Amino acid sequence: VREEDKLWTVKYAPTNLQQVCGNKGSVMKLKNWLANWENSKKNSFKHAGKDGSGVFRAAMLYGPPGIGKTTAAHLVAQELGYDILEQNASDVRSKTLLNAGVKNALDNMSVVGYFKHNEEAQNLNGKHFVIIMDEVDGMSGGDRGGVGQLAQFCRKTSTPLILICNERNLPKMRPFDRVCLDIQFRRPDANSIKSRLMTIAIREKFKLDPNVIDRLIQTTRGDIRQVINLLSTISTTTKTINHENINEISKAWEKNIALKPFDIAHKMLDGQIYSDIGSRNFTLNDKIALYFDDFDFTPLMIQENYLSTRPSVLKPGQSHLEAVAEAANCISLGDIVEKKIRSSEQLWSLLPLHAVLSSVYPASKVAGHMAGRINFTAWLGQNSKSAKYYRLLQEIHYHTRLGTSTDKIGLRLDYLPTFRKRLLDPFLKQGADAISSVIEVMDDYYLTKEDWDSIMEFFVGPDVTTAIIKKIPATVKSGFTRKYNS
């Protein structure tokens, strides 16, 4: 092996913790967490401490790629005497063999730490393992991939567990919410990377000035690996870099990453984009690509927060209400288009049209400043709640079908306003001696206690029984529960 055969990112890789750039707080927190790991296992993780690290036996590092998560993890692993072990998605990771291996390795000692050196007074921890998992977000979605298996692994283990992923808040990563201590590595500061670039430039005889690293890391968006690769790629031809050719370099190395459904909502509802000047800079093709970055949450977010802005593109003689009405009309048209898309015939070739009608046109109608905060779309939770209520109403209707002889909606609209007066009202106006009447009325339609509980949740407006059931004396409720349980 020679020197010119490795990339600049490998020959300038950090050899110790004192050369990492930025995120000093995170690396110190993880170092303290790994240091007190045996102090945490000797008392079974009950004492968390002042740092709050010690109750969780696993640590999950999450942040953008290329900021030094894996590097810092490996560095602290070699520095604290822990015998390092790495396994990731590049190797086979399933529910069958990965689970078996990790289970056999959670409370087994290392032979490498035993045979290498075990006689000097270095540490009693060399016999231990540190299972460092990389690309945790790269596993398969289902349980067969091993994400839930690893989540359960982070609950029962005698060796420190280190998890490293690039994307944290994902559905697949939901089980890791309350099981492992979360550490977030953030965008590094400009000074440390500036000094590192100064050093790596003076070492390679690369002419470079301090005025350009700011724009460089701005267009790179906090990625030291990409910056190093950029310098290694362009330093071979252009020996001296300055403020003359930096424009072409920034335009050719623009990081094209898809935005989250929250930044997409900010860019869509930005009034400067739709101005006469901003139109010829962020063209309509870019606006459609914005929606195509995430075409599942963009229309919902747009419909949620299109009427929560202050418009700055109002035509002369048009109020905010008119623009909101036109935006809602286009939202309805885009909804019709989406229904035509995600139905039979699979008219997916209409996806670009759904880009304009659902997101682009309503946002353009009410583009401007953001008044409050970008609120997440509540249509998902409302749909889930409506589905649960529909399932409950279906159970109630199929229980009462033997007597009602009506439909689901016909039972919800008209029958429930009378079932409320029949079941619950005798409890408020008669006391605890009206239990038998309610029991007979419920058995007349084969109702259950769970059905009685679910019935009182359908009413709204001036009839909210959530406090009426609490106003009922607890004696009557206990007597009813005991009577129905006999």
């Binding site: 009427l307 309805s332 909804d335 909606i409 359908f458 709204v460």
Partner: protein, 338 residues
């Protein structure tokens, strides 16, 4: 109660004498009977009349029915669970209990019942309006291929979403809502049998005037207000209105009072709270528009635009799936109109 006093035969019907005579004529010869489609307002009594007609085609055991369960497998491993109302002479299916999987249940179940078979077994399709166009197309040929073993009696409230082939493949029977006088006479027999105390009979008439021909709603409201007056209705007993109707009325008051985006947010919130509690959006739009037209503050120019926008957004909702996306648009258009 609605269920305690319900006719069980054709001779027990107490309104629409011409319809009862037509049903008797149609049940005189039961074997040469084509498929039937009962259409009319919701709450008229068509589901009782279909069972009464079955009671004339078969023995009295048609009402002794049982609820069973049947499982289906779609193109994926998602298991479709559907309960079936069955009788030793007929069976009832309600394809309105699932999503876009109506075609599978329809075709498979009807083919199983037709291959196993007075001489035929009647089939009652409840709420045929929720039947998707693909399920109706699948039933189109099943109605004709097996006509000697399976006869369909489809109960619906409006033939608008029913396709033309299905309309042609079955006789159409209209059930007009009973007059206020017949509703009053029925409520009289009910209150004399349930031992209610009426200071003046005219209140019963008012019940009819509050039900808009609906007997199911009329009897339920009468019983609900009989529990508030403690089994003794007075001359000025208040009318018991459902909660969602009061919410819609308050929504219209908010609409005519304030027309702005800040009020549009709370309007969207009210729409979400209404939709989350098992309330269809078409009925919400219908009631909202009808009670907005009742606002005396508006003029003919406003009401015409309101009804036009309601028709447009009703078409939108019938062509869409995200109902609030059309409801909020209609509300915003009404706000812009006023």
């Amino acid at each position: 109660w609605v269920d305690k006093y319900r006719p069980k035969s054709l001779n027990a019907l107490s309104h629409n004498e011409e319809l009862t005579n037509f049903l008797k004529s149609l049940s005189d010869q039961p074997r040469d009977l084509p498929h039937l489609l009962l259409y009319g307002p919701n709450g008229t009594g068509k589901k009782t009349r279909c069972m009464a007609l079955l009671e004339s085609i078969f023995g009295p055991g048609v009402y002794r029915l049982k609820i069973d369960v049947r499982q289906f497998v779609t193109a994926s491993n998602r298991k479709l669970e559907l309960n079936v109302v069955s009788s030793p002479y007929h069976l009832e299916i309600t394809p309105s209990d699932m999503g876009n999987n109506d075609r599978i249940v329809i075709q498979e179940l009807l083919k199983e019942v037709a291959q196993m078979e007075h001489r035929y077994k009647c089939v009652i399709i409840n709420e045929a309006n929720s039947l998707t166009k693909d399920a109706q197309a699948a039933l189109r040929r099943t109605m004709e291929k097996y006509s000697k073993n399976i006869r369909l009696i489809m109960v619906c409230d409006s033939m608008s979403p029913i396709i033309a082939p299905i309309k042609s493949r079955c006789l159409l029977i209209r059930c007009p809502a009973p007059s206020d006088s017949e509703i009053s006479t029925i409520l009289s027999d009910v209150v004399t049998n349930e031992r209610i105390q009426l200071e003046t009979k005219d209140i019963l008439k008012r019940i009819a005037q509050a039900s808009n021909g609906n007997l199911r709603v009329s009897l339920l409201m009468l019983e609900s207000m009989a529990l508030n007056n403690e089994l003794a209705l007075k001359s000025s007993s208040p009318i018991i209105k459902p909660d969602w109707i009061i919410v819609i009325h308050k929504l219209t008051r908010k609409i005519v009072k304030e027309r702005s985006v800040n009020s549009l947010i709370e309007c969207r919130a009210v729409l979400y709270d209404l939709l989350a509690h098992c309330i269809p959006a078409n009925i919400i739009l219908k009631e909202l528009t009808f009670s907005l037209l009742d606002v005396e503050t508006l003029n003919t120019t406003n009401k015409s635009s309101i009804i036009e926008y309601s028709s447009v957004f009703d078409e939108r909702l019938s062509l869409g799936n995200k109902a609030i996306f059309h409801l909020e648009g209609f509300i915003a258009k009404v706000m812009c109109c006023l």
